[PDB]
Design a binder for this molecule. Structure first.
Ligand SMILES: Nc1ncnc2c1ncn2[C@@H]1O[C@H](COP(=O)(O)OP(=O)(O)OP(=O)(O)O)[C@@H](O)[C@H]1O
Ligand SMILES: Nc1ncnc2c1ncn2[C@@H]1O[C@H](COP(=O)(O)OP(=O)(O)OP(=O)(O)O)[C@@H](O)[C@H]1O
Ligand SMILES: Nc1ncnc2c1ncn2[C@@H]1O[C@H](COP(=O)(O)OP(=O)(O)OP(=O)(O)O)[C@@H](O)[C@H]1O
Ligand SMILES: Nc1ncnc2c1ncn2[C@@H]1O[C@H](COP(=O)(O)OP(=O)(O)OP(=O)(O)O)[C@@H](O)[C@H]1O
Ligand SMILES: Nc1ncnc2c1ncn2[C@@H]1O[C@H](COP(=O)(O)OP(=O)(O)OP(=O)(O)O)[C@@H](O)[C@H]1O
Lengths: 362, 362, 362, 362, 362
DNA sequence: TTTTTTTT
């Protein structure tokens, strides 16, 4: 009796698997009797134990197949096709709505029965970030708007300050939240072709540490980034499509995603100052260092740099109406759980401790 | 029974879809009951909802096939082959009548029963655009004719002027009108010597932000582009056909399209000046800023960058005589609606509001 | 019943089509009934309407094939194999037979139904060229047959006159007539090696105006260019093969093609001077330049840079018995066309205008 | 009858083989009579002699197959697919316990009765290592935690000291313990592209003997290592994912591994001190050298370089609780075996011999 | 009925054809009705007309095949396989007999009834060559024997003398006779490495015009070649294998083949002098240039560059026993033709007339 | 056959 390629493709759709090897590896695990599947019994991976019983019968036949890689290839192509269809038809608003559902699904697991995440430690992170700048949650909403609206020539935010001032920590959390990618421009001009190629079909991008010149005035080593960026105004402006690379592949042509650039205190040509719609400056603060020193689970679990921490901040601080109609349903459930499990006094005790530079918990 | 690759390819032709993954994904949607189909019920996407009922039966059989990418590859190749046969056999006017049919079909949808936008906003756009430069509508008709007759040497156009003078905005609108592609000239030539290969089978191209020495005193760094374009005489003059590059695929040789170059105000070598038909000398125009500020919907919906706005302008301004007979039928029929939906006093009142720096609507 | 692969191959041979997508696109059109075929009715394209009725039955069955691109790939291989067999086997004269026909085929278009070129202004080019120097149709015929015979040492002509005296412009016209390419030698010696690689397999070559040292005093741009040529003894003589080089690619051996050198009036080592068959003075002549200034279509349509204008000069002046033995027949309808379109008196009047320096058609 | 592909896939999995040729060559050996297999009888290779009898029947049929390389390719994919599944789903602690279990398995052979090694010599090596630095075993534990926790911007240790002072010796042992790669960055900036590609999916990296610039008064050569590192800040900090390269392969996104930098006595920017968690100063010491000369079987067998030696040190020194839970059973058994075979006096005698610079053994 | 792949393999072998496209093209020509074949009837290409009559029936069936290129690929592989087998197993003696048989076949054509050149024209060539140096025939016999034995150290011959003194003329004819490559070592040390790669798997190499440094006392321009050669001593001595490299490609290891060195009368190191078997001095002699000046068909037909002329000289001068037994029958036939064609009186008249420096013929 | 190499 033959393998159902249909059942395989459906698993890859359900789990959104992009990699033929990852798909192959995981589907093989289903060959063993789910009745005794130690992994299922220990509930260690949703993408396994949700599926093993359903796929077991087909996986036994797949284990014998001589075609295996071909079956997986067709499955991955279907998931890739679904992505291109979506990328060419969704509004950016709908795209963000989908991303939030993915994160909320992960949160339901993290704080779920398996429950590995202590929501107390995660909410401590929210207090730390809300402390990092005035009106923090308002600034996040402004960033989200302009990423959604993607207004031409008003498309990039500039993060500037001295070192150890948290700007890349914030950028990392924002980047996880929207699911962009990071890129280098402190490079020779040739290499940029395949480098910038990975921006293909991403929602957002981040450029790090772009280097000005004469920076040794400020002990900054002078470098390529700023002058490479003035060579790229059109990619910033997003006013027209551009052509993007891959090895062993043709171009694809598209408008280039919006995003964020991070800066030591170099000087900048005003052609670029014209193009950054907004700038915010970060400045070091002693009590934050003391707090982290007392509370290193914030770093060790990477809480302060996760988009999950930003999402919790928004759920706490923003009206339900600021979210799209579909997710408002889930937003309501999460607002309930947070309010129930964190009395305002608890959060105030936390935010107090952070401001004092004390260990957040007491 | 078995998949009709014929019915597949008919969809590919009729959608003009020429991406194998896009096609693959698109067709797979039809596997579900069209009678229940939520996208059909929404009338969400024309390239779905017109076809779902027709292709449903074949797509069910497609959904079980094991040849799925191979089926799509043949289907895409007939679409691409059709473009090739057209690209040599059709006369340039005939090409434009095809392109204008394409844009009119979109306009039929946009201002269709969905009212996906309101033409009042787009006509405010027409007013804002015609407000840019003297006799604006007329200059476009001259440029169109230059690209039609494609006369050698007198074959390229310069836009010169400061940032936020709108030259890129004009360029974006013209390219969205014609179809064609952009390129960057500010490169080492042996890099550009592959990128020029993009021009294949295109009607038009545009070259962005040429840089040269003698700008750098004005926050306007020099670049290779000025000398590159001075040297790219073949591509410019169009007095002969030239090679165009590809990867894992053969080159071809053909006439290089006509086109436009944009500059901020570097110098120009006189022989390169002499290779233009014309130059146009963009400026700030202060009250437009004020209008735009109120008129945020203009940029949010990208109206003033989009060739659809130009098409509404030429319909509004030009004699019905300016077009080929078959489209003159559609021109007349569509030109009716503008009276049904505007008085001239409204159009006057709009351009007045523009001139007055008001929000265009009242 | 089945696709004849044979019939597809015949059509590819008859079209001499060497593009698989083009062949695919073309042949698919025959699947509709030839009996109504509107391209046939309109007699638009012989490569269609000559063939449809024969191929129709096979094209229908072809359109149902699942293998289509494979059929076409074999057909294109056949045409490429044919070219390679001939390319190895045939003589310089037989190859000249080809580029002759290619140039006549272009003229049948350029002055055909489109009227894209004004045959009068182009024959006025023939006149203006013919008055540069003595008997120019003979001077061409002498040079041309010299390039066919490719006799060792007897292979290179020198142009030596001051600026604007025509050598560059003439060299351009010569290249259009012939194909081939020009070359730079005004260089440090390392560069010459890849430069010379351009000559590989060219039917003719040129050397760009030499930086002759012994030009310093003449206020000419000057240097090793001439001493490089004097050093490169053997390549000109072409008695024996030599190696040639391309970047990122291996060495190759050729008899170095025959060609032309041009200069302003440098002083010359008589060793190098002894290598030439002819050296030709050029004088700037007021009547020539002022006629051009009165006749600028000659420049704008680059008629004087047209090698096709040289082919007209052959067709007009030279006797039928001088052209390629059988293709002489094809020349006579061209002579007949020109003889009908142009009395000798109008060509004479034309020459008499430039004989007054008056614009040719004035 | 037919080949069981499944049995081949099992053999690949059981041997964890992932070279197609190694797998092929290995499997082919089973085709001869198991009952006479001299390799089995001589008990030379366990990956042979465990398996020949099981696989024999299928190996004979495989020997006749016409598909041999395709059969092997599917088997190697299965092993590679498992590695990627693990790379995404395992915790860093689990990865380390898997690595430990494999070393412990290798130790079981070496000190098996069939084993070649002498546990007294291997224990002698531990005495030399525990003399190389203060509190050596505690330093190993602190480093292991540092790599398991992988705390961003607290991920890298700096080894520096004179030449012939044991830094690369110690790095090699840690690298064999954990698995990882060494890398060279005293390079031109371009080859760094592919060089950093080597880090892909590794656990550790070691940057070996980076060169500073200047201060050749220190007798140090100069090179670009430190100037490259001061650029590569993002790869050290490990705050965000980066994109890595391989020849003929498209760019791969992951967070960059933690690791070690080794360096002779160059001075260093504080910008790089700011990125190293800890700095260890190695020093040359006479009694180590004098002991080592008399104890040179240590060198001959590479005992001092090898991760087995560090693992033995941890088993001797560390409490059982510090090992992850599942291995505590095996660790206890090895502790008992060590105690059975060495008194404290023997170990303490060895250390005294090392301190006295006599040969370790007596 | 079916294609015989064997018949295609045989044709490919007898024609020694290496190109798929070439073989494909050739074989398709046999499908047209053999009896009418104008190519047969003109008797031009022997690789056609010797075979068309035989292969005709198979060519018809091949013309209908669906997998034609696969047939031709296998045939070409058979030809390529035999070449590598021979490269590894032939004696140098046998290689030369094979090389000679090829030339003898071309001579049977050139002087057959269809032969376009005339044997009297070529015997004029032999007479002129015999006058260039004393004992010319015996010199050539010695040189060939030297290459055939390839005795180490006794491997290389030196040509020196003024410009236009015939040294490269002779090298060309020898290289045409034996097969091989020229090389240029007037280079910096880096470029030599790829240059020496040209020698890979050749029979001879010629180092052309290695310049010495200094010696402008003789007006010889200085250059590095001689200094480069004195480093390369081991390549010349030929006593042990060397490593050779090519662009994009690996090393190869082999004995560097024997060859010829040419130059003007530079100084020599005594070390380099000792590495040569013989020095042969060239000098201008006026009666040769006056003879050429009155028999330029020698140059025009490139007779004196040709190894065919050398082979003709060997046949005229040397005993039958000096040839290898395999070809002695063809040699005797060719001698008998020549003796019947020319009386000694004719040849003696030619030689004397050349000594008078008059045109060869009377 | 690109990409890597080579060109630089
Ligand atoms: N505002 C701040 N004041 C004091 N310490 C800070 C602040 N922000 C971050 N930190 C500390 O600095 C560490 C590094 O933060 P981060 O990498 O985000 O800084 P950065 O300025 O963006 O750095 P870089 O320019 O090197 O990328 C954090 O882990 C935290 O310990
Ligand atoms: N003539 C104008 N006067 C004032 N503002 C203008 C004008 N034209 C455009 N703008 C503003 O500048 C923005 C950018 O316009 P656009 O990119 O077309 O200008 P540009 O001159 O081509 O600029 P750049 O050289 O930076 O690409 C527009 O979206 C609009 O907000
Ligand atoms: N003999 C001539 N007398 C006058 N005008 C001429 C003559 N020959 C050419 N012309 C015109 O002068 C232009 C420039 O001529 P051209 O570049 O061919 O001269 P050149 O001798 O090669 O010059 P240069 O040495 O400056 O490059 C031509 O394109 C043509 O328009
Ligand atoms: N602390 C030490 N005291 C004395 N001799 C030492 C010491 N460490 C190493 N040696 C000797 O130096 C040899 C080389 O050791 P190793 O290669 O680790 O040196 P290194 O200085 O750390 O090298 P590198 O600079 O290349 O990393 C050892 O085999 C041993 O003979
Ligand atoms: N010995 C000679 N006496 C007189 N004329 C000669 C002699 N040898 C060659 N020639 C003339 O010189 C021309 C060039 O000959 P050739 O290329 O062989 O000279 P070469 O000195 O060996 O050259 P090169 O310096 O390039 O190695 C010949 O075609 C002939 O006209």
């Amino acid at each position: 009796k033959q393998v159902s390629w249909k059942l395989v493709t459906e698993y890859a759709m359900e789990t959104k698997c992009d990699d033929v090897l990852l798909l192959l590896g995981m589907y093989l695990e289903f060959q063993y009797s789910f009745e005794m599947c130690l992994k299922c019994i220990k509930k260690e991976q949703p993408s396994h134990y949700k599926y093993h019983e359903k796929h077991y019968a087909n996986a036994a036949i797949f284990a014998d197949s001589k075609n295996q890689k071909t079956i997986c290839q067709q499955a991955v192509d279907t998931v890739l096709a679904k992505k291109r269809v979506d990328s060419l038809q969704l509004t950016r608003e709908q795209m963000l709505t989908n991303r939030f559902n993915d994160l909320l699904d992960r949160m339901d697991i993290m704080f779920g029965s398996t429950g590995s995440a202590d929501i107390e430690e995660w909410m401590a992170g929210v207090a730390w970030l809300h402390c990092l700048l005035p009106k923090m949650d308002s600034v996040v909403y402004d960033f989200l708007k302009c990423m959604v609206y993607n207004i031409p020539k008003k498309r990039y935010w500039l993060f500037k300050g001295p070192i150890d001032s948290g700007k890349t920590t914030l950028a990392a959390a924002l980047l996880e939240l929207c699911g962009g990618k990071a890129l280098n421009v402190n490079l020779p001009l040739d290499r940029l072709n395949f480098e910038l190629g990975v921006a293909i079909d991403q929602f957002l991008v981040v450029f790090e540490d772009v280097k000005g010149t004469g920076g040794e005035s400020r002990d900054l080593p002078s470098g390529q980034g700023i002058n490479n960026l003035d060579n790229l105004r059109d990619y910033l402006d997003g006013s027209v499509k551009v052509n993007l690379e891959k090895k062993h592949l043709n171009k694809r042509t598209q408008i280039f995603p919006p995003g964020i650039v991070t800066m030591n205190e170099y000087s900048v040509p005003k052609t670029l100052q014209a193009r950054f719609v907004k700038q915010i400056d970060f400045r070091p603060k002693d009590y934050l260092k003391h707090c982290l020193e007392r509370s290193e689970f914030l770093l060790e679990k990477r809480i302060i740099q996760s988009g999950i921490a930003l999402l919790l901040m928004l759920i706490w601080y923003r009206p339900v109406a600021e979210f799209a109609q579909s997710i408002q349903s889930r937003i309501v459930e999460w607002k309930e759980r947070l309010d129930k499990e964190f009395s305002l006094s608890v959060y105030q005790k936390m935010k107090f401790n952070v401001a004092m530079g004390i260990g957040v918990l007491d």
